[PDB]
């Protein structure tokens, strides 16, 4: 009986069958036992093909919190009836399991375990209410590494034809070839496409589409919604390729948190506080799905298990009980809290679901034990679950008040509750945590009764309710005013939240007559459509946050309201209130100081005070002073103000301490003091800084003492450099514009003295120069500072620059460049220095620093500045300039008379080039004034 002519066996099956012939290749009795089971395994395999699926059981829709259970295939007592010591059955899974999850591993293809789940477990699970599903790898939608049925690619090919032809064979193969209730499909890191046992990007790809095809066939969108289609995960939202385009096609997520990780989550020392946390991992998932899709699971204790896969999510055997293999209590597990967890927010879980439902009851192996590969301790041995475990905890869920229908004691209105229902929820824990919308714009509501049930809701929009008379405290939500989260944790950990007030808007309640809107601290009133509530007589939005400035469209709701109740019964200190408004001061987007101008004179001046300032309303009211608030506080409103006679202007204001200033004079020197001196003539550019950041500003002004000088810039920045002993690497970096951090080295070489030869990236007149010593970047710096520099220019009139840009190295010998200024640092601590510079035009410099130490002796400096105006073609603008001066010394070639003419022009252009306000337009002009005289 060879092995390939057994017809019904599946080619894994015979691929098994084969290669054990290989081994004992020719053993006469063991190539004997082989083939009689590879065949006993093909007249299994077709009783397979011949049993007859029942007739599916009719089954009541999901409800109230469910629980879930992995049933591992290979403890089913059928899977290999051989192993004597497997004693469960799937088919024992008591009513309480809403849903059976069929997980399948080692059960052979010919096993009759699939003859006995799809004849005899599922109809009993069904008579039940218990639905079988089928768990499938992410990797069966896609690729082709253990990729099950989408191995065959001609057959199915990745294409969007080819995807509906894979989307109906998953279906057809895991689904309905059993009559199964639903399909699972897992994905984690373990079960992603692979292909070369290389996550595969094109594979990932191509599930999100089948995903999506299956969609079309099972599932809330399928042609076919008995069927469930389940998605388990453990990624976080934001991380899960399949959530965005899948979550609308399946009815519930089930995501995989074991072990105190998934609880606490985990902790990351560079915040100081945990992330993926369980608050958190469905904060992501709640933009996707419903929260009573989300089902939290945890993990039983396996047989046999190893680091990275103990949990300790049900209690441990106590290390003296040596021979107690059993535990069923829930009472201090994880697991019991995880059925008792509901979210903060949205509304509450669909359940909880168990991984490895067939070691219900088995007691965890001690910590102790965890490292020990090999050690077998009473916990590793195979038990009967009566399934205690499971039993217990969906009593616990099964009896919480959070899922109690919301009935007409919620909501006596019908018109009401069934609008709650259709938007919120159909749970009283749901009224205690539902953070979105809630519209109510069905006219028939005769009563609001019962919103104050609402703890967290975000917008509450009432439209067009015309029975409706009164609005008050008792009838709105309860966070109407400030509050904090009170829904205490049941979970472990190692503050509690605030709950946004409601935002309410209002329109169309014509049969509305009093609004009270008082001790709310309410910071405005927009939603408030006044305009419509024609039949208003009493209003009061006293003892709030709400600025009724006139012009504020605070007031003009108010004035609107007002106009409507002095038609209807009068306005009076009892129809109309307003007072003991507390507004909340805030920060501007922008400042109006952006120049401050002062004289010459020696005093002193807070850049605080005078350019960033001013406190702003959220209705745009700008007060700037002390004075401004009693300007304010002096709006009257029938007679009489509306602000809090306790709120002063220190209660008010918001606090500018803590805010730098970064000044910056003409020159680029850098100051952070808030005081300034006018001492100096100069024009300087202050940055404000907010503690919260450091690198953009909140404001920026131009002070002016004195005569307006424009402000230079670093024509140094971006330079080329071209030559010097200094690393030419780290040479670069002191024309990189920012000093740089104290981890970068930035040592320019070896030796003591270290040039840098460099070109400017464009034309421009120098007139400054600076240099940074090593103190400015980290003041505790241990690189001594520079004693002596000298900055240089090429000597163009005797040397050819081509010379100089075709060896560029020969010339670093002083002898080639000439001294513009030298530095002496006299022995004075000094962060850096700066000197003016004599008009100069080159584009070809260089630069020499010394710390005069013999040796180990690092020049380090993080910048250095040659500062200017940009001025095109200043060496023919500097060169004429020269010429006239020279002209002007021949007085037996020009008479007198033409030189006074032509002084006036060379003065003139001089004048424009050393101008306080530089103007390129005025010196061309000059420049070519003179030329032309010439
Ligand atoms: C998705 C999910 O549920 N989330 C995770 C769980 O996945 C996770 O549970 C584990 O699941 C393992 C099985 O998962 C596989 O199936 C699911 C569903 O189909 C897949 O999603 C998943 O990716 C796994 O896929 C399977 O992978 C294998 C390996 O590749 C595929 O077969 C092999 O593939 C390779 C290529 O990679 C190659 O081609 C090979 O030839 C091929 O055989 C397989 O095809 C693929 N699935 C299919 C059908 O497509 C469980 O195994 C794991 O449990 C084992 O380990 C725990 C450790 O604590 C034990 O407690 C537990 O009892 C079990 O032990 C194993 O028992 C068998 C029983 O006999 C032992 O077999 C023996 O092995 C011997 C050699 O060692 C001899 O060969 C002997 O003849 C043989 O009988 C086996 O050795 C035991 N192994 C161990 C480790 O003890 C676990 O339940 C859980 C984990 O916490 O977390 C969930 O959230
Ligand atoms: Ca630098
Ligand atoms: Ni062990």
């Given at each position: 009986p060879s092995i390939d002519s057994l017809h019904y066996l599946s080619e894994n099956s015979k691929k098994e069958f084969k290669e054990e012939l290989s081994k004992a290749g020719q053993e006469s009795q063991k190539v004997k036992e082989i083939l009689a089971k590879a065949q006993?395994?093909?007249?299994?395999?077709?009783?397979?093909?011949?049993?007859?699926?029942?007739?599916?059981?009719?089954?009541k829709p999901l409800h109230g919190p469910l629980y879930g259970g992995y049933f591992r295939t290979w403890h089913d007592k059928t899977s290999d009836p051989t192993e004597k010591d497997k004693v469960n059955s799937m088919g024992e899974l008591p009513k309480e399991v809403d849903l059976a999850f069929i997980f399948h591993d080692w059960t052979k293809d010919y096993s009759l375990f699939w003859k006995e789940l799809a004849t005899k477990h599922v109809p009993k699970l069904n008579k039940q209410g218990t639905r079988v599903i089928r768990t499938i790898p992410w990797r069966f939608l896609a690729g082709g590494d253990n990729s099950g049925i989408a191995e065959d690619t001609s057959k199915y090919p990745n294409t969007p034809e080819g995807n509906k032809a894979l989307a109906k064979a998953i279906v057809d193969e895991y689904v309905y070839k059993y009559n199964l209730d639903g399909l699972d499909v897992a994905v984690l890191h373990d079960s992603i496409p692979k292909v070369d046992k290389?996550?595969?990007?094109?594979?990932?790809?191509?599930?999100?589409?089948?995903?999506?095809?299956?969609?079309?066939?099972?599932?809330?969108?399928?042609?076919?919604?008995?069927?469930?289609?389940?998605?388990?995960?453990?990624?976080?939202?934001?991380?899960?390729?399949?959530?965005?385009?899948?979550?609308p096609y399946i009815n519930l997520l089930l995501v995989q948190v074991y072990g105190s990780q998934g609880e606490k989550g985990g902790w990351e020392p560079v915040s100081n506080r945990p992330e993926k946390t369980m608050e958190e991992r469905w904060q992501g998932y709640s933009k996707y799905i419903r929260p009573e899709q989300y089902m939290i699971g945890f993990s039983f204790y396996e047989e046999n298990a190893q680091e990275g896969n103990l949990w300790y999510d049900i209690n441990s055997?106590?290390?003296?009980?040596?021979?107690?293999?059993?535990?069923?209590?829930?009472?201090?597990?994880?697991?019991?809290?995880?059925?008792?967890?509901?979210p903060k927010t949205g509304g509450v879980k669909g359940g909880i679901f168990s991984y490895a439902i067939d070691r219900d009851g088995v007691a965890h192996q001690p910590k102790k034990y965890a490292k020990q590969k090999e050690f077998k301790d009473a916990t590793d041995n195979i038990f009967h679950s009566d399934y205690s475990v499971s039993k217990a905890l969906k009593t616990v869920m099964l009896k919480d008040k959070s899922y109690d229908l919301i009935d007409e004691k919620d909501f006596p209105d019908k018109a009401l509750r069934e609008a709650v229902m259709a938007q919120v929820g159909t749970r009283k824990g749901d009224l205690?945590?539902?953070?979105?919308?809630?519209?109510?714009?069905?006219?028939?509501?005769?009563?609001?009764?019962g919103l104050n049930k609402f703890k967290k809701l975000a917008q509450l929009d009432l439209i067009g309710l015309s029975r409706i008379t009164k609005l008050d405290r008792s009838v709105l939500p309860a966070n109407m005013k400030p509050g904090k989260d009170t829904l205490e944790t049941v979970l472990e950990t190692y503050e509690p939240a605030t709950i946004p007030p409601?935002?309410?808007?209002?329109?169309?309640?014509?049969?509305?007559?009093?609004?009270?809107?008082?001790?709310?601290?309410?910071?405005?009133?927009?939603?408030?459509?006044?305009?419509?509530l024609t039949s208003l007589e009493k209003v009061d939005i006293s003892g709030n946050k709400l600025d009724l400035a006139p012009g504020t469209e605070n007031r003009q709701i108010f004035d609107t309201m007002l106009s409507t109740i002095s038609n209807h019964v009068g306005s009076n200190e009892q129809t109309v209130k307003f007072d003991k408004q507390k507004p909340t001061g805030h920060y501007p987007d922008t400042y109006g100081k952006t120049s401050l101008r002062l004289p010459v004179a020696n005093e002193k001046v807070d850049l605080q005070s005078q350019l960033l300032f001013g406190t702003v309303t959220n209705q745009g009211t700008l007060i700037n002073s002390e004075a401004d608030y009693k300007a304010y506080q002096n709006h009257k409103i029938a007679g009489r103000s509306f602000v809090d006679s306790n709120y002063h202007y220190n209660n008010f204001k918001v606090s500018y301490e803590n805010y730098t200033v970064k000044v910056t004079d003409s020159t680029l020197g850098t100051t952070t003091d808030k005081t300034l001196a006018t001492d100096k003539e100069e024009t300087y550019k202050v940055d404000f800084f907010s503690p919260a950041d450091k690198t953009k500003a909140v404001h920026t002004a131009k002070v002016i003492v004195g005569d307006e000088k424009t402000m230079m810039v670093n024509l140094a920045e971006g330079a080329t450099v071209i030559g010097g002993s200094a690393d030419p690497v780290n040479a670069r970096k002191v024309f990189d514009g920012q000093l740089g951090s104290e981890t970068?080295?930035?040592?320019?070489?070896?030796?003591?003295?270290?040039?840098?030869?460099?070109?400017?990236?464009?034309?421009?007149?120098?007139?400054?120069?600076?240099?940074?010593?090593?103190?400015?970047?980290?003041?505790?710096?241990?690189?001594?500072?520079?004693?002596?520099?000298?900055?240089?220019?090429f000597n163009i009139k005797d040397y050819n620059l081509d010379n100089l840009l075709e060896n560029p190295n020969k010339f670093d010998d002083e002898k080639y460049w000439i001294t513009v200024d030298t530095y002496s640092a006299q022995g004075?601590?000094?962060?850096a220095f700066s000197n003016t510079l004599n008009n100069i035009t080159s584009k070809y410099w260089r630069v020499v620093?010394?710390?005069?130490?013999?040796?180990?002796?690092?020049?380090?400096?993080?910048?250095?500045?040659?500062?200017?105006?940009?001025?095109?073609?200043?060496?023919?603008?500097?060169?004429?300039?020269?010429?006239?001066?020279?002209?002007?010394?021949?007085?037996?070639?020009?008479?007198?008379?033409?030189?006074?003419?032509?002084?006036?022009?060379?003065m003139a252009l001089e004048t424009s080039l050393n101008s306080k306000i530089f103007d390129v337009t005025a010196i061309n002009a000059n420049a070519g004034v003179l030329k032309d005289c010439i």
């Open positions: 006993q395994a093909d007249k299994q395999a077709q009783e397979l093909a011949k049993m007859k699926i029942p007739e599916k059981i009719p089954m290389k996550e595969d990007t094109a594979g990932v790809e191509r599930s999100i589409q089948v995903f999506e095809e299956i969609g079309k066939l099972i599932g809330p969108k399928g042609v076919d919604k008995s069927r469930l289609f389940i998605m388990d995960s453990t990624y976080m939202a934001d991380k899960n390729p399949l959530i965005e385009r899948g979550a055997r106590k290390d003296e009980d040596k021979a107690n293999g059993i535990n069923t209590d829930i009472t201090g597990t994880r697991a019991e809290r995880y059925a008792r967890w509901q205690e945590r539902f953070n979105g919308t809630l519209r109510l714009d069905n006219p028939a509501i005769q009563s609001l009764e409601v935002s309410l808007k209002v329109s169309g309640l014509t049969g509305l007559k009093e609004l009270d809107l008082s001790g709310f601290d309410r910071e405005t009133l927009a939603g408030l459509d006044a305009a419509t970068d080295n930035i040592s320019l070489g070896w030796d003591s003295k270290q040039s840098i030869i460099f070109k400017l990236k464009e034309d421009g007149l120098i007139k400054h120069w600076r240099f940074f010593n090593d103190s400015a970047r980290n003041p505790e710096t241990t690189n001594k500072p520079i004693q002596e520099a000298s900055l240089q220019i004075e601590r000094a962060t620093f010394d710390t005069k130490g013999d040796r180990y002796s690092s020049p380090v400096v993080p910048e250095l500045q040659i500062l200017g105006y940009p001025l095109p073609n200043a060496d023919t603008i500097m060169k004429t300039v020269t010429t006239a001066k020279e002209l002007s010394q021949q007085k037996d070639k020009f008479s007198q008379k033409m030189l006074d003419e032509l002084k006036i022009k060379e």
